[PDB]
Amino acid sequence: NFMLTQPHSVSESPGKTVTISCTRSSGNIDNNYVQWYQQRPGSSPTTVIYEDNQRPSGVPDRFSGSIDSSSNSASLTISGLKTEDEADYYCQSYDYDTQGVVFGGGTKLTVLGQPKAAPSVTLFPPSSEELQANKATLVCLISDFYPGAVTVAWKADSSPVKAGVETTTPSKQSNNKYAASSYLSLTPEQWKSHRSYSCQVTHEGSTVEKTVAP
Amino acid sequence: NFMLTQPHSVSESPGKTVTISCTRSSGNIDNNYVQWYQQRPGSSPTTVIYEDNQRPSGVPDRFSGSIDSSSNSASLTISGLKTEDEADYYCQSYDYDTQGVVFGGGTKLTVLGQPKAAPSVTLFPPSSEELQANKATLVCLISDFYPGAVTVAWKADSSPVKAGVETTTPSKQSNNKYAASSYLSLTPEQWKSHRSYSCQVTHEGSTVEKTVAP
Amino acid sequence: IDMELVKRKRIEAIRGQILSKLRLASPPSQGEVPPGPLPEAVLALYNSTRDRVDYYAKEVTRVLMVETHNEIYDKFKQSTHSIYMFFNTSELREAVPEPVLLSRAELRLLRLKLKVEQHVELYQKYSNNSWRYLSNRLLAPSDSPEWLSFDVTGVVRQWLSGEIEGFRLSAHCSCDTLQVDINGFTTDLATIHGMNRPFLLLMATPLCCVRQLYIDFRKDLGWKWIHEPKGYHANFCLGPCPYLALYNQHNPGASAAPCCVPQALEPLPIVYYVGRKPKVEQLSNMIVRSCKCS
Amino acid sequence: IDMELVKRKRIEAIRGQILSKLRLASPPSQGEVPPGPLPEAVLALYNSTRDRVAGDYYAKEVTRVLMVEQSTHSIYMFFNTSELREAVPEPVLLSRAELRLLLKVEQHVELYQLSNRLLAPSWLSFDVTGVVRQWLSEIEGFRLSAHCSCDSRDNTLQVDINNRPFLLLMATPLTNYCFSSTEKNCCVRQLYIDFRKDLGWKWIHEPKGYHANFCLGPCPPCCVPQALEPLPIVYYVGRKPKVEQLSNMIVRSCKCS
Amino acid sequence: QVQLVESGGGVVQPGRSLRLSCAASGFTFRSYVMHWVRQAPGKGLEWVAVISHEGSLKYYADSVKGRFTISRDNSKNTLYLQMNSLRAEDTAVYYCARPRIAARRGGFGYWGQGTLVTVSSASTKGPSVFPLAPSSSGGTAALGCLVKDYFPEPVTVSWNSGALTSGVHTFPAVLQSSGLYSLSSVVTVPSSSLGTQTYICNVNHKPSNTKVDKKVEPKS
Amino acid sequence: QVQLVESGGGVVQPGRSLRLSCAASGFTFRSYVMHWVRQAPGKGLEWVAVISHEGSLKYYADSVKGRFTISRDNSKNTLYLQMNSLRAEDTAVYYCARPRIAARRGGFGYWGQGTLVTVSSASTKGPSVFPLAPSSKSTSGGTAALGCLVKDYFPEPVTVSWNSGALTSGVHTFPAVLQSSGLYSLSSVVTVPSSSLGTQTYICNVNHKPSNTKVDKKVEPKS
Ligand SMILES: *[C@@H]1O[C@H](CO)[C@@H](O[C@@H]2O[C@H](CO)[C@@H](O[C@@H]3O[C@H](CO[C@H]4O[C@H](CO)[C@@H](O)[C@H](O)[C@@H]4O)[C@@H](O)[C@H](O[C@H]4O[C@H](CO)[C@@H](O)[C@H](O)[C@@H]4O)[C@@H]3O)[C@H](O)[C@H]2NC(C)=O)[C@H](O)[C@H]1NC(C)=O
Ligand SMILES: *[C@@H]1O[C@H](CO)[C@@H](O)[C@H](O)[C@H]1NC(C)=O
Ligand SMILES: *[C@@H]1O[C@H](CO)[C@@H](O)[C@H](O)[C@H]1NC(C)=O
């Protein structure tokens, strides 16, 4: 089916207002109604907007839906942000050529409760000991950041790698900021045949790259 | 209630047409719909006319119904009588003052058919066995007559007996004729003290007598 | 399916319909009524409302136009091309006390021997001088007297608040360096004189819902072939029709089994392509605006 | 009842309502559609049907015919019946025909060849179906004059007077009564009500009863009244006889809605 | 096929109680008003009671009000009549009836078969069977059997145990003021055979289960 | 009121099959189309499959087409999902959802609580511990980072200490990653003075008591 692309994360201070975008990859956004779900961790999801702009009863008017045809997107807008609005938000539409339901990738909304903080990134190459066991793991460690949402991209030389990546969901540490890690599995041969491998971490529009070489 | 009065009995021959009237004692006849039911011996009533003049399907159009304001009456008319038309006919109406369903007393229509036939009468004196147990009954057996009306009268020698008489109603026969039975019971004393007893059967203005004696 | 049971339920609904329409809880008394036949003024009025030409019952009254030898014809004179019909407003107010009570007023004329198309116009008398066209009728010839009926509710409502007010029924005029066609040069237009003269017939008050549903052709049906409109308000009817006496919203037609159904619909024009020539088609009864129990 | 379930079902019913009105088994093939926007001649004709001004089951096709080349006392409008025969090809197909047109004080106009209208200060539409029916049987036109009153005072008679036009046409392209005891359709059935006999009512003096009738029968949707008639009655309150009219008392015909 | 099947009738003495039932089928019973109507043996129809389709409005004839109650169980498609303090005058065939539109407009459109209620003091008894002496063209002869003083009526009579239908006339029973029934049955037979054949008269009384078989012949 | 309770979630060997249930109360379940939606840990919602209220009609996402089958039985007001040839890809929380008019119009009006199915073969297994040799962290701050990689263990937990608890400052042990295989790995890092790397030795003490595994790994520079 088509794709619905949402930003990985948005954040704003309490009382402020924020918008979450939902762009459709192909065909006109007006072909189909768009739905918006809120999901709090541990909870099953609930509706905040349906039929592009309608609120279920009990959903306050701080939640509004809209459609921008000029940019083939749907927007969820939340005004007077409150701590309780922290959740993942999903948009949802329908295709008619796959008779299928399509979801956006989801957006973590953080209601800022402390100053923004950039991640520090440490990248380790595989050890001699792992290589002598015919394996190879690159370890990318990400810490001290707020809000708790990052994107991780790996490169072989300067080419993106997606196979063999596993990245954790960030969680808060004793310092009150977030940490995460991502692991890239290679064969020893891949690790030795490339000039370098990179881990690049995106947070609040900013990227930090670390790179290691045989 | 108010009353609905119909003649007790009408006798007509096949082919002829007959009218059975049903007259309302108080309150205009136009105040309530009138129904008519035919009832054959030993079966439940059916409707021949409802809503003063409507005929249920299956009922031949020989049956018609009417209302006569002048005589405050309703009438069922059966034209071209057939023998199966012999039946009891009840009119029915309704009393708003009492919330009561009102029936007429009914009219036995004897539809003649078949020529007149005189009764046969056997008269049995009390048994050897019955006097032996201090009871004496005379059994007067009337058969093979048509139409089905008789009267029976017993006589103690010459004087008429009313006491101890029980007479059955006429019932249809082997051969669409009619039969009836009368019983007179007395003491052994009264049985042999009188000179002789007689049941005499009157049918269509003619008497047949049978006599038994001690 | 037992029509005899339906008749039973239709009949009992009639009982409720008539009492509720008269805003009575139980049928009224009698016996204060004398025996025998109604007064002929009542029969005339009743016959008038059965002549052929809101939920709650209207009282029907009648006021005949003032007799033609009074001051009618002291001034403007009856004719065969123009007739004049005046009414004593105090009598009108006698039949319908205040104007808010009036629900309908009909001016009734008994048309005579007619043997050619006459086109006539109804006018109201004003201030004390001029006239306002009210309406017109095109009358086919006929050798049978037929009643004409004109709706004059708004005018009579005003009269119910002058003292002598009138109508004029005249002949029509074609207008076209200007030319005009005439009728009035040959030889009474409609019945005046007698007790079938014109009269005002007066009806007066005495002293399940449509649900919104929008259909987007692409979004709901995956339909791209309809180029216009993009969508529409189809709506629909829903809600119960049960059976003091409401009766007016639940079963006003006294059905044996009322249903929530569209009361007023309207069409939907669409533009689409058949082969590759554009079509414009009007589809009837696509949009529900109101519902009723019937 | 869940309103959302019934909404699901109305939606899927619109699918078949539209298609069967067009006598179509499936949406027409649109792989040949001329691309981009749509002709403004078509859209103008769509605009004219959608909007209204002072004014059967199957889809009717809509066609418009403008006018050919006067005062503010009269406006003459002509059309050639050639151009109209191309719109509605044969006269019996004509479903409806309307004439369209486009001030300080009230004025009162007339249509001759018919009707007349009173215009309030500030389009316009006239039903001319019968006139346009016979025109399709060679050049005909419409008269929009002004209105005049005439009467007689002594021997004195008096008279007083105070995007081009377009003809919009719809066309088809190239009620049951039961007396049987058979229920196969929706129909009006006879029912007589006798006030005294059926209701125990003595207080209505005039109509002894009336033919109320009723609707009944299946529909492929309920069988309901289409046309009703009022019932007048006479009764007494105290010593006062009264005539009352009751609306919607008599079922004259039934439909399915 | 509208059907109304009634049950519960029987013999009972005055003061006791019977409950009649009317089992309906072939229609949606719970939409209809239902009635009871009764008919005393040999007499006219008499309306007894009416009940609304849900069961709250019940009306009765004055001859039964306060003694009878009508009711219905609609989940069982059954109509009921509760008869208390039964009197002789209550002896009748009881019919349940469905109105045609409404009884006051179209009368009754369907009647049940009927169930008989007999209110009598008489206790069950078997009959003494006395024979009808043969005597009085002479080429025939009157043979019969008298059966006297029995309570529940239905009683059956045959001759020769079956091989004689030419001549049997069995007469409908009479009811004595005693409260008890009696009947007789006759057979005309050739007097050619009164000196040769032997004519067996059999009579069955199910309520008694007393079957006395008497054979007919003359007396000295 | 309107409720959907699910059951039958569990842990399943990779090639096997479960059947989830979704019992419904509070509404006429017979009249409603029903859906299944799933969510892999940390990832988005993914529509799985749908059925008409009659049986009759069933649609599926490509991701499960030949494998999953929906069924329902209205007599028990219960919706089912026979899953076939499960994978770690299919490891997810499964939701049954009721649509709002229709999923394509108003989305899903109600969801169940979810049941977790984890498709793994992970058996109780101790880690491999690999040293992560120091490299420069901040030249200007004069620090290096070094650590230990505790790879491929099951189940959690694992405890990590440095120099038998004498080293605390600068120690960060990170939350484990749950791999596709059902096994966990974590890392523990120490920020230390880079000028000390020739003098101070650094050993990470790793314990995984589920398998009575204790490992000390010396972490040194390299040539
Ligand atoms: C309001 O409207 C009603 C109905 O339109 C009018 O009622 C009619 O009135 C006339 C007289 O005014 C009635 O005519 C009389 O009919 C008699 C026979 O009546 C029977 O038949 C009719 C149908 O045929 C039944 O409806 C009715 O109930 C009777 O059963 C004649 O015998 C009379 O003739 C005698 O009188 C005339 C003069 O009136 C003489 O010339 C004759 O020689 C003779 O002596 C008479 O013709 C008519 O029956 C009524 N019809 C109905 C349906 O009721 C009202 O008159 C009208 N009232 C007003 C005020 O407008
Ligand atoms: C109007 O009618 C009343 C009562 O019938 C009468 O007294 C009065 O004179 C009439 N008005 C005129 C102006 O004649
Ligand atoms: C029809 O009306 C629309 C307004 O919805 C307008 O934008 C368009 O230009 C109009 N077209 C014509 C031909 O009048």
C-alpha–C-alpha distance, residues F44 and A22, integer Å: 14
User: Measured between beta carbons, which residues in chain F are less than 8 angstroms from residue A37?
Assistant: 45, 107-108
**Six token digits for residue A175:** 């310092």
A21 and A58 share one domain: yes
D64 and D185 share one domain: no
Contact A62, A53 (CB under 8 A): no
Q: Kindly determine whether residue D145 and residue C174, on different chains, have CB atoms separated by under 8 Å.
A: yes
Q: What is the number of other CB atoms lying within 10 angstroms of the CB of residue E16?
A: 12
Contact C71, C112 (CB under 8 A): no
Structural domains in chain F plus CATH codes: 3-119 (2.60.40.10), 128-219 (2.60.40.10)
Backbone torsions φ then ψ of A83, nearest 5 degrees: -45, -40
- Given CB atoms, is E105 within the 8 Å cutoff of chain D? yes
Contact F47, F64 (CB under 8 A): no
A8 and A105 share one domain: yes
C135 and C165 share one domain: yes
Q: Which residues of D86-125 are buried (b: 16+ CB within 10 A; e: fewer)?
A: ebbeebebbbbbbbbbeeeeebebbbeeeebbeeeeeebb
* Ligand having the closest approach to the CA of D208: 1
CATH assignment of the domain containing D237: 2.10.90.10
C-alpha–C-alpha distance, residues C125 and E59, integer Å: 65
C-alpha–C-alpha distance, residues B78 and B107, integer Å: 13
In terms of residue numbers, what domain contains A139?
A: 120-212
Cα R_g (chain A), whole angstroms:
20
3-state secondary structure of A96: coil
DSSP H stretches of helix in A19-153: 128-132
C-alpha–C-alpha distance, residues F116 and E24, integer Å: 56
Domain's final residue, options A86, A111, A136? A111
Contact C290, C210 (CB under 8 A): yes
Cis ω on the peptide bond leading into residue D39 (within 30° of 0)?
A: no
**Six token digits for residue A15:** 């009382």
C107 and C227 share one domain: no
A130 and A91 share one domain: no
A106 and A154 share one domain: no
Report DSSP letters for E129-157, one per residue.
Answer: EEEEEEE---S--EEEEEEEEESS--EEE
B188 and B105 share one domain: no
C171 and C235 share one domain: no
- Ligand 1: residue whose CA is nearest its atom 59: C44
* Residue B115 belongs to some domain of the structure: no
B85 and B125 share one domain: no
Could you tell me what percentage of chain F is helix, strand and coil, using 3-state DSSP and rounding each to the nearest 5?
10, 55, 35
Nearest to B98 by CA among B49, B32, B45: B32
**Among A1, A101, A123, the residue to mutate for chain F (most F Cβ within 10 A):** A101
Q: Quick check: CB of C88 below 6 Å from ligand 2? A: yes
**Six token digits for residue B152:** 């029976």
Q: Which chains touch E (3 or more CB pairs under 8 A)?
A: B, C, D
Tokens 């008429």 appear where? Answer: B160
In terms of residue numbers, what domain contains C220?
A: 3-9+208-293
Contact E150, E125 (CB under 8 A): yes
* Residue D236 belongs to some domain of the structure: yes
Q: Kindly determine whether residue A46 and residue F111, on different chains, have CB atoms separated by under 8 Å.
A: yes
C-alpha–C-alpha distance, residues D253 and A194, integer Å: 89
Nearest to F91 by CA among F120, F66, F63: F120
**Six token digits for residue C189:** 């237009």
C-alpha distance from residue D170 to each of D91, D101, F107 (Å): 11, 18, 40
CA distance to partner chain D, nearest, from residue B106 (Å): 23
C214 and C200 share one domain: no
CATH assignment of the domain containing A168: 2.60.40.10
Could you tell me which residues come within 8 angstroms of residue A204 by beta carbon, excluding any fewer than 6 positions away? A11, A116, A118, A147
Contact B101, B85 (CB under 8 A): no
Pairing of the two strands A171-172 and A120-124: unpaired
C-alpha–C-alpha distance, residues A166 and A187, integer Å: 16
Could you tell me which residues come within 8 angstroms of residue C91 by beta carbon, excluding any fewer than 6 positions away? C63
Specify the length of chain A in residues.
214
Q: Quick check: CB of C44 below 6 Å from ligand 1? A: yes
Q: Kindly determine whether residue D11 and residue F105, on different chains, have CB atoms separated by under 8 Å.
A: yes
Contact B113, B14 (CB under 8 A): yes
Backbone torsions φ then ψ of A56, nearest 5 degrees: -65, 150
Q: What is the number of other CB atoms lying within 10 angstroms of the CB of residue D132?
A: 25
D67 and D145 share one domain: yes
**Six token digits for residue C74:** 């002291």
B105 and B124 share one domain: no
**Total beta-carbon pairs less than 8 A apart between chain B and chain D:** 10
Domain's final residue, options C204, C239, C273? C204
DSSP H stretches of helix in chain D: 3-21, 40-50, 81-87, 129-135, 195-199
Q: Quick check: CB of D38 below 6 Å from ligand 3? A: no
**CA E173 to ligand 2 centroid distance, Å:** 89
- Given CB atoms, is D83 within the 8 Å cutoff of chain C? no
CA distance to partner chain C, nearest, from residue E105 (Å): 9
C-alpha–C-alpha distance, residues C270 and D62, integer Å: 10
* Residue C220 belongs to some domain of the structure: yes
Q: Kindly determine whether residue C8 and residue E109, on different chains, have CB atoms separated by under 8 Å.
A: no
C215 and C233 share one domain: yes
Q: Quick check: CB of C64 below 6 Å from ligand 2? A: no
Domain's final residue, options B84, B110, B136? B110
DSSP designation for F156: S
Pairing of the two strands B151-156 and B165-167: unpaired
C-alpha distance from residue D161 to each of C126, C176, D108, D235, E109 (Å): 18, 10, 9, 51, 73
Domain's final residue, options A94, A111, A128? A111
C144 and C183 share one domain: yes
D44 and D137 share one domain: yes
Domain tally, chain A: 2
Cis ω on the peptide bond leading into residue B41 (within 30° of 0)?
A: no
Q: Kindly determine whether residue D11 and residue F101, on different chains, have CB atoms separated by under 8 Å.
A: yes
A105 and A130 share one domain: no
C61 and C98 share one domain: yes
* Residue B65 belongs to some domain of the structure: yes
C200 and C73 share one domain: yes
Torsion of CA D101, D106, D110, D116, to 10 degrees: 90
Domain's final residue, options D152, D171, D190? D171
C-alpha–C-alpha distance, residues B74 and B55, integer Å: 15
C-alpha–C-alpha distance, residues F5 and F79, integer Å: 10
Domain's final residue, options D147, D171, D195? D171
Torsion of CA E53, E59, E64, E68, to 10 degrees: 40
* Residue D2 belongs to some domain of the structure: no
B75 and B134 share one domain: no
* Residue C122 belongs to some domain of the structure: yes
C-alpha–C-alpha distance, residues F112 and A43, integer Å: 10
Q: Chain A residue with minimal CA distance to F220?
A: A127
- Given CB atoms, is D225 within the 8 Å cutoff of chain C? yes
C-alpha–C-alpha distance, residues F139 and F118, integer Å: 44
Pairing of the two strands D240-256 and D223-237: antiparallel
- Given CB atoms, is D3 within the 8 Å cutoff of chain C? yes
**CA C93 to ligand 2 centroid distance, Å:** 11
CATH assignment of the domain containing C175: 2.60.120.970
Q: Kindly determine whether residue D5 and residue F31, on different chains, have CB atoms separated by under 8 Å.
A: yes
DSSP designation for D196: H
* Residue C218 belongs to some domain of the structure: yes
- CA of residue B142 relative to chain centroid, distance: 16
3-state secondary structure of F19: strand
* Residue D218 belongs to some domain of the structure: yes
Q: Kindly determine whether residue F106 and residue D4, on different chains, have CB atoms separated by under 8 Å.
A: yes
Tokens 């399709």 appear where? Answer: D136
* Residue D17 belongs to some domain of the structure: no
Q: What is the number of other CB atoms lying within 10 angstroms of the CB of residue E214?
A: 18
Domain tally, chain C: 2
D154 and D75 share one domain: yes
* Ligand having the closest approach to the CA of B69: 1
